[model samples]
Target chain A: GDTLNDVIQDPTRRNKLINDNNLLKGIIMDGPVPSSRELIVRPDTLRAIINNRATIETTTMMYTSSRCLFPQGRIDFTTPDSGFDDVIKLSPQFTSGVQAALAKATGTEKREALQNLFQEYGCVFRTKVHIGGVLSAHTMETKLNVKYIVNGGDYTKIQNTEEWVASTNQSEHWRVIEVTEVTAVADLLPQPIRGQVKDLLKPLLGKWVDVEKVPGLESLPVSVYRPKGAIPAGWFWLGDTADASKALLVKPTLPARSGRNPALTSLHQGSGMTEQPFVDLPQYQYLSTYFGSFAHDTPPGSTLRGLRPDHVLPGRYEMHGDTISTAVYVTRPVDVEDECFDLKSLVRVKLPGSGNPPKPRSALKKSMVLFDSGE
Target chain B: GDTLNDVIQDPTRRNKLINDNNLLKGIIMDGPVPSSRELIVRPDTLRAIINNRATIETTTMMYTSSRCLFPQGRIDFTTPDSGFDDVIKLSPQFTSGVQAALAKATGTEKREALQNLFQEYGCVFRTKVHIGGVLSAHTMETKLNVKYIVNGGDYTKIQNTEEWVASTNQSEHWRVIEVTEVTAVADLLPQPIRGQVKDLLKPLLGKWVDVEKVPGLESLPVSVYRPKGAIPAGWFWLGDTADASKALLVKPTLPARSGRNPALTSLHQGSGMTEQPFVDLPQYQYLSTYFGSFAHDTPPGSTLRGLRPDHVLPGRYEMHGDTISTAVYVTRPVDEDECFDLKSLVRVKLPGSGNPPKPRSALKKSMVLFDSGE
Candidate 1:
């Protein structure tokens, strides 16, 4: 694992749009959409399947520090992995199973020191394989009731208070936490949300508010409302029945006119379930909650444009209670392949001058079999 | 495989109608429809499929001696296991890594083995598989010079037939056959009709009327005609394109001018290309292929019809030349499981009319989660 040769294949540097620092507290998406140019991947790939009936989806984080949150853990689609295609048929589902008392609190001399930080990369799965746990994010004082505390304090200052810890420095110890285990979002939230935040994240409240990655960021038709114990980092709540390792922060209490704060839960001991919170959005990948075009009184008519890039665009939105849900992925006309012989040779049907049983990519030099690329 | 545990879940003892001994040698179904009552499955389930391509279909079969074609490879509506309520997602593909060229000419092995035959037994294949062979068949005399030469005799009686050989005995040896192999149904033909001849089917010449399995038996509207060497045993050219395997009788030639001798093909050296010829037309667990009373022939006021023994008849017809191709398996109205809670309550969606998506068994007592037989 070494670097200094980064290449992202530019479309205006992979066409980026990133708007979620709550772009200064706004966007409830009825319009003006973009939680931009996103592509998040972490312990991700969950396919909850049942058969003889049909349901289908196919696709393909790191963090640590005094910041904590826990209890057993785990968690794609056409979900982000579409940069025009390269074969990805994923059907994922695995709730990071552990807790046979965390491999019984190991000690082949501390499970052989994680076997010298074991490393064996390069994975892509197909068919029957579910040994679960791979793709990763695990912290909350990295594990030692060995990962437990829903409440109560001073478990020796929860793994010696590190260099991170700002939700404004109320330093998490959701008291004696670290309840159990299931470690690795490839070893912590793409290294704590790509190294701590702001220029546009501009210092998020001791960094609290995961509110459950907001229902598959499936892009903008969605979310707004905050009140679960003084939470803010641009006020947001994520519920598809929210519980991404429970924590609620906002603390200062009572409208004593001088009583300026309210809502806080967890003060001492946090992180257990093998130091729960394993991450991965990496599975074909997904995130695009909103982008719009259809309110026309006319304008955009230069052959009606806007919405470029490999374009199936739309994270297909979701939000809960006061209900706000949306869906997208309407691709059809399948039955021809060369991995889409150049988008069905330029997709055409032309019905106006009237037609049927005729007309289809009317062959512009079709009939392929070119060969001999040398032995 | 053992027996006298005989019970085929009675629907009038598995509702029957088998016109190809040609029921009184009649029927050319352009209309008066035995033409509709169809559900066919031949060298079918050719799911040489693929994905991001999207496809579906599933279930089981066998032919002859009282397994005698009933409601059919006969099977499932949301199919035998559509329920106990909710969720299924699959797009898993693998070839069992070629040692088992997939299903291993399987016995279709283990009453429903999924090509994970690759054997997973309980399967619901999306759109295709024959790449999953579950394997069998009879003629091509069993292989010898490995077996050939049509119109002529004794070629040592074709591969020394020990016993089993009848259709009352035209005992196939149409002399010198397997002229080469990619032999699934193609060469012997793409070579057959190599020539023709007499009485019910007078020992068929250089014998090659393999008119091909009539293109995969997916039947409905229909087809008719014969004479690629005088054929007749109640004139049946059986198409979802016929050839699940070849054998048929009826004799005497030059038409007796009494024309009607139909059906015959591939007589020697077969069990090659792993003898394939799967058959299914336990025709329709059906009720409406085109049910009459013309949306109520608006008169006869409401008269009904019958055949009894649990019905949905006519395994529609078709066979050889004159262009009568067909197709069936309409089935729609999905969602609601207990794998098919008695045909999803009563299967509807087609009422008042702004039309369709309404008739799904309007729940009389529908409130669930009983789920306990503890």
Candidate 2:
């Protein structure tokens, strides 16, 4: 049924992936190897990583339009939209309707069967039409009866812990290029390599008003935020390479009286400025790289130094008797620098009770003749 | 993985069953047996029937407690709940978390593995305890995060449908029993079967004075609208008794000076009547036998010479190239009475696009090997 050239589809690639599972399992079982700054890919996260990887690879086949791959500018939604599906095929409306009707069912036997389904999938009634911007009809109405279609499987064990704001409060890339106590979270760069950021911020945390910033700092990699703020750290190279006497000038701060998170919005749109727009979009650094797993939130505003994605295994203070053991499924470092990727959406949760979930039975049967389906 | 004496479980029964499957396939392909009155089960419905039957037979192993089989009254939620199992080990919530995270994922290699699992199950997070009552917390709260541990499989194909209420004008079910002409849509009964009731009423649309009442009509099978109606024609034996010659009566009608549908409350709990309380229950003839697949809700009173159960496949429904067909999946005579049964809940619906619907992929890998799982 699946006639795509996807890695999962390619028998060779699938076996290759299977081969790594045992290896990853070994890494999880043994202590942190090479160093503690690594994460074992959570099985769910691993699934997420593979899916993300596949999505990018299949773009050639999935979409005719090239722009769907890199949505850099306002591309036409019509054609590009097909490349990236928006309508949630399995909406909550569908699930809720199914749940309600099944609840009222009278017979015990049917109730049992209904529960087997209700127990598992987030199955629902859906319209044949696409939902996002189609008829504007309720997904339930689009279809008259409850169509036994399942999607997005039930709610993922993981939930929307957080939707990830663009520039985290009062913090854009500019905040990091200067002195800030909290700049240590950038997951892109590790503490050992990009560790000098703390030194860049500590001195300027106070007040350094004299404008005119560092010549080198003038050309930072984070172009999105560099326009609004300037830091005078001659050791600018050490932000990625901020240590070992890189240029050591005092970091720049926002000129007094002008309060703003050295933001792109400051680069006022069509103030007729560079081809950029006036709107301050979320500070997202599109990570189409290995270091950036779906595990990590889109590392906001470039400089991925020290920003660790929220750990897949949450940090917990287990009580004396309760020991919290987990396979911290973080990515193993691909770069020489210890940069691990985190899965963005769900980190599979440990469920109790029943073990091993059933795969959705998609083994399509050619002829399931229950009294001859339609003669 | 599943072990039990049930047909779905046992192989001897399984082979015997497999043998019958081919035979049944032929019979089903051939045409209606006995008469056109019988329903040829829909594939989805047939699956439902088999699943339902298996569920019944596997009760012994499915439950350790004696009464997990019948949820008669309000049994204690704790103990009784256990034997049946709860903690949604494969909660959809868990699957959603994973799906959302996985969907946004970039990197082709990763996407490939994702789709493999993604294409399949609806695995979920769960605790060792029954969620609702245990944490006594909201089912949502029982988890700290989308803890990974897949259970059960993907969601089943047949889902709940929007049960079309007859006349939700006032309050859906309660009001339909009143007016609005074609309110022949009591959810308790399907449409095609009762569609004719409207034609039955239109001829007598005018007001008729009646301070007086029909004698011996006070006690009727259906108490709701009997207080104010009637008609001649002794065709009142087989709503339930359709086949046999059966006793005939000038079917009862509403008596004069009375109000509307009999309220369940009107049946009074303490009218001081027989051993059983006053209010009667839904007219359910529980069918534990074959052919009587699901349950049914026969209108309390009845008439009409030959109003068959919507003719398992309604005729001429195709008035203008638009043909309508239905299966009155009702009872075949228990003893030549042409009586059938209807299941109480939704028998699964036909699914397209997603076909037969896939259970979510919850196939647990034998060794997930977390650091130190308890």
Candidate 3:
């Protein structure tokens, strides 16, 4: 059991022992170790001992740093003047030789050689110290491998749709002013009346204020009265009136009745009952009390006459289909100076046979008198 | 005075007078009368009276069909043939004129005039009616005062960018394919697995199947299978295996792992290896198997080789610098005659000169030994 042959006889145990020894050797050989005292003993001592012994006079050989040759021969020392010149020169020369030899042996110059060597001999090598660092280096190498130097020609050859410009023609430009917010002095009001106040002020959306243009009104100011209280609380009347006439009067139209036309009816054979009922016309007027004098000129070329009730009457009548029928005409008065005008006389006289024709026997004069009373 | 004045003074009681008078007029104008008794005498008396009435009395004034200027005035029943003919022809002409006038009044022409009148009167008219029997007519006309037609040239010009096309050096034709409902297939798998499957089958994304080229597999029937109870259900498969292979493998590089570099370390070390282990030839062979098959083919005349173990090894070694100090030297047996020649020649070249030349060693060497039995 003590001899090598006895140890080798047991195949299973021997194989395990050999493997353990191999692993231990690998570990020991790779890792650094502290020198032992025996190994450190000077060679001079051995030489001295050998010389002194009469029976065994022998020469001792010791390895000196000066005599030992590196794999690539004597290592060159860098001079003070040429700081790292020697190392620089030697490293490249050594690396080149190694690389060339490797390339020839593995039948590859760079990547191929390492790949082939690894394939043939189950061995792996890393150029960097740490695995992570090695990976970084590999990435750099791969980048260099596939790095393409794109030139102007390459850019020109790339037919990308994104680079296309339809034409050089100038396009029309449009400018728009969008009203993002409407600010009013009336906003500082009660919630219930804020909406009504805003609606009332909506007409001023695009209007410009010119306070300085008016006379004796250098610091002219207007207040938007709200339901809760007056905003910009401080006020100066500036001799201006806050009369109801200045306030806008909105007349809501009356809903139509079920069975009454409200227009004139014709006269019948009833004695002393030839007149239709007079219907009062609804009217709305915009009045200016204090500033009425300021608006006296009514602005040049302004058609104030167009606002007269008579010009607007025809349109209103047409809207209600108030044509004079026989039943309405027969009940009306036989004649009343202004009220009995025939249709021919009422229409415009820009055509032939324009004179007022004689009233036919079937034509009954209107008896109702409708009038607008101005206040 | 109490009866008449009170009744007349009351407006409701006075209405009775009008109603009574209206009834009196209706009876007096429309009442029936009885026939005379003399007119209904015996039949002989009626006959004698009728015979007496038959005798013409010249003294009695008679209204004749035609008036004669002269005695008998050659009572002409027929006028000139041309005159009669003209009269007959005029009847049809008058009828046609009346019909034409009626059509002009009621047809589309009259409607157009009415529409114009409405426009002038500041009215908005819209008509939605069926044209003939098939088409629908939708016409909207606003008052001239409210809206007017602006000519194309008069209106501001707008440069439309929607239809604008960029200039191209190469002409590209668009191929239109009509897709039917049957051709639409639903994906039966979850998103992750679906993505994986898509990635696996990306090589066949747009490859065309040449049905005409195959013999029995003509009209290469291709369909996407969406099986309800399978993982690989959403895959598209071709009926012919050869066609499938050809189409599926067209984009071989698409399925390749894409990144900046091949995942090979120096000396073919993998991501798992912290440092490049100093390995023997056998260990390198294993590494080559593990990490070297990831290299991509480079351009022509390049040092890079395609995805082979050898090509990938050097990339790994250069990328990972774990054990750069180590050197390897390979050698074969020097003598075949010596029994221990293989063992003796299997030496690692070290990097120093000495009496024994500092020969490096392998970690382990395995051998299979067979004995010669007696």
Candidate 4:
């Protein structure tokens, strides 16, 4: 009694029903319809399955060394004669300018020289921001809500909006400004000079830069670099003084612009599906607990994640300032075939509404050189 | 009828009666005698007093240390040469005479030479006699017994006795020719001298003594002559070998002798009266228990009286031959102005018979330095 055209006229509904049936089969069976079988399921099994899925999703979502974001940022350049000319000078020249400025302000040459030296070397400078409040998100999400009220101004913006070149890179064609003179002051220079210098300066650009003055500025954070045929070794942390109190302390909060933002989604479902449970699992909890608080409060420019409460729970964390932080530098030889343009990236976040805009996190100002001839 | 003269004539009977009268008075009253006229005795008491007096006379006796007898003996020395010429030539000419005699007998010079040496130096000849065994009269009451048995036969009848000049006094002395020596015959010297010569003359006398030929003769008892100032001033048990085995050993005995001969009646009577049970009394028993036994089968000498056992015990007692017993010599310097001669003594005993002698008992020898002036 039904006409054949009626079935044709509602073909969309048939397709929908078929799709729903397949979905249902997938939920309850072991295989496709032609060869499908029902999976044995207890009433409580679905909850566990959902939990497992969530864990897997969370694990894929969390950041690791491989997933570390190298966010890109703009690099601004300027001529030598500018308002920021002092910043572009070598260490001695820069120091002289600071001394002159201080002398002019204080009306006493001795006081000014002392103040200038103290500002430049005797004391450490650190930049930080304050987060407005805490934010929440699911374990499988990468939504980083950064609500920052910058305590220290944005360094990149200050130099860029005006015209300035703090320091010049020796490679004239590269047109990059050096951010720090850490290697110059260090007795033992970092190896793979260019890469070490880059790594040492990377954290100084956007992060809260601490310029502490003490002694023995080596051994902090943890780093390692291996040359072509040399041993792979590095320092762990750094401080400017033996007394921990003399150490320049830096604490930062997330920027307001990135408030409550989910940065990445989990590749796997649930929280720990793809994670090594004992190892990666603790890192997840670390992020969720103490580190979450730290990231929440830290503002962008080169903020130090001091010793986490979990790392030294029952003991006090003492820092000898004479030791330097280990996040100095890293280098890899250039590949000739790679593009020679400066690849600028933001390795760390900047506080929102800072007087100065944040600088790029990382940049390769010169081309990587790779030998084309086998010989 | 009882006259005063009768009482005096029969004093024993009279005394008995008097004692009886006192006995009666004792029983009769606690009061004093009534008067000089009172009769003090009853007939019953007189008879009892006589009996008690008789019992007293029968029971009483006494004893003392002198009433016992013990054994005794002595040792005598002899000289070998008769005259000054004999004493001097006997040592040298005899050597040539013996060699000629040996050469004539053996018809070989070498053999004769050896034989002559043996004849001149190697022999010890002597004759001796035991007067008698020490009697109890000589030993019974003394702390030590001085007695000895002759080593050989009767030398008393031998008429070839020699007379010689004494070394110190130059007095004519009867000497027994028990030993001889020839200076030139190395082997013919008495064995004791052979050893002594090696020790005394290691350099000049060594060639004549043939010191090396004497086996086991290297160690000889030396007589040291120290001038007055040579030795340091100190008390010392001099010349004693440090060897512990050379130290004196002592043992005392019981039943010591009393001085009086036990066999004599007067002495026996006195001993029975005053010193009966000699071993039971404190002084004699204790002393005898300390003197112990003797060595060499002879009683100790009279000079050893009162000598402590340690002083008499042998530091070392050795027998050089069947006839001679030797002991390590000990001496002290003579006191000035004291006229005394050192007399050596030892205590010894013979077993009953047929039994091997017990190990030589302690021989307590002491020097009897008598003051002839005293």
What is residue A238's positional error in candidate 3, in angstroms? 29
Residue A4 miss distance in model 4 (angstroms): 99
lDDT tens digits by residue: candidate 4, A66-108: 1101001111111122122112222444335443544443223
Candidate 4 displacement at residue B216 in angstroms: 47
Clashes per prediction?
157, 105, 28, 114
How do these models rank on TM-score, best leading?
A: 1, 2, 4, 3
Candidate 1 per-residue lDDT, tens place, B1-374, comes to 11101112322211211111101111112121111111122211111111111122222332211110001011111111334232121112211222232234532221122222212111112221111001011112112111111111111122222211211022111111111111110011111221110011221111123332223224333321112433333232211112223322211111211122211221111122321121112211212221111221222111111111121112322122233222322222233121111111111221122321111121111111121111
What do the candidate models score in CA lDDT, each in turn?
A: 0.19, 0.19, 0.19, 0.21
DockQ of each two-chain model: 0.01, 0.01, 0.00, 0.00
Writing each residue's lDDT as its tens digit, candidate 1 over A1-375 gives: 000000012222112201111111111123433232211222122211100000111111112211122111110112111121222221121101111212334222222222211111101111111111111122433243133221222243334322111110121221111111222212222334212210111111112333333324343223321223433332222111123444222211111123311121111111332211111211111111111221112221111111111211222111222322332221122222122111111111122222111221121111121112110
Off by over 4 Å in 2: A1-375, B1-43, B46-374
Docking class of 2: incorrect
Q: Give the interface RMSD values of the models in order.
A: 32.2, 26.2, 69.4, 76.1
TM-score of model number 1 = 0.16
lDDT of 1 at A339: 22
lDDT per residue for candidate 3 within B1-374, as digits (tens), equals: 12223333555432332121111110100121111101111111100000001111122121212110100001011112324432111123222322332345433333333222222111211011110000011112231111111111101111221121111010110000111111000021234533332233212222222322223312222221111221122222111111222321011122222221221222222233221222212222211111112221221101111121221122111111123233222222222122111111111222222312211221111111111110
Native-contact recovery for every candidate? Answer: 0.00, 0.00, 0.00, 0.00
Local error of candidate 2 at residue A112 (angstroms): 59
> Tens-digit lDDT track for model 2 on B252-283?
12222212221111111222222111223232
For model 1, give the TM-score of chain B. Answer: 0.14
The lowest-lDDT stretch of 10 consecutive residues in candidate 2 chain B is B130-139
